[PDB]
């Protein structure tokens, strides 16, 4: 859309901005995704989205051996940024998520509600330039979606425990949990 040095500034300033909000809302309690009952046989949670009708997620299909782990949004986004403004998976701004060519086709799902949950992207840590960032193996488009409704905290999946910690070290709120012990825990609680 505009040149290098262009994309570099912009990224630069907005890494900037989620530092500072980052560093104002720090300790501050957020709003946590819901496990819910749901008709299925399946992890759901509800989301509160801003402004907007409640969002729900889905683990089902996840692996046993994978992990969930709950990210602060704007830590992700800001670890997203990270990659840089080349890659194939970089992160565009906020503002111009909304344009990106299959955020039609997310919003639709997310629409939808409890009936049919969307399911968690799948997220790994990686290392760009020297520094900490997150890729995806899939899930951008709805990652976009929910950064874009400034949902505040949602959980995503995660190949492998150390990744999972590293993870929660970088960009979560809490532990990371197995998706084989949550599934079991929602069973004999709920
Ligand atoms: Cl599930």
């Known amino acids: 859309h505009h040149m290098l040095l262009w994309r570099r500034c912009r990224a630069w300033l907005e ?66 940024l990270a990659l840089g403004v080349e890659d194939s998976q970089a992160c565009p701004l906020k503002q111009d998520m909304p344009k990106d060519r299959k955020y039609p086709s997310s919003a639709a799902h997310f629409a939808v509600g409890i009936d049919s949950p969307v399911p968690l992207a799948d997220v790994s840590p990686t290392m760009i330039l020297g520094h900490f960032a997150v890729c995806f193996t899939d899930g951008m488009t709805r990652s976009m979606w929910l950064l874009a ?24 709120v809490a532990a990371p949990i197995q998706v084989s012990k949550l599934r079991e825990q929602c069973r004999k609680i709920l």
Not at 149 to 172: C, I, K, T, Y
């Open 149 to 172: 409704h400034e949902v505040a905290v949602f959980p995503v999946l995660s190949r492998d425990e150390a990744s999972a910690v590293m993870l929660a070290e970088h960009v979560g």
């Open 15 to 80: 890494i900037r901005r989620l530092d500072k909000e980052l560093a104002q809302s720090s300790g501050l309690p957020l709003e946590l995704p819901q496990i819910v009952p749901n008709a299925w046989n399946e992890v759901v949670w509800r989301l509160p989205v801003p402004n907007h009708p409640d969002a729900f997620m889905t683990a089902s299909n996840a692996a046993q051996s994978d992990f969930i782990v709950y990210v602060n949004g704007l830590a992700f986004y800001r670890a997203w």
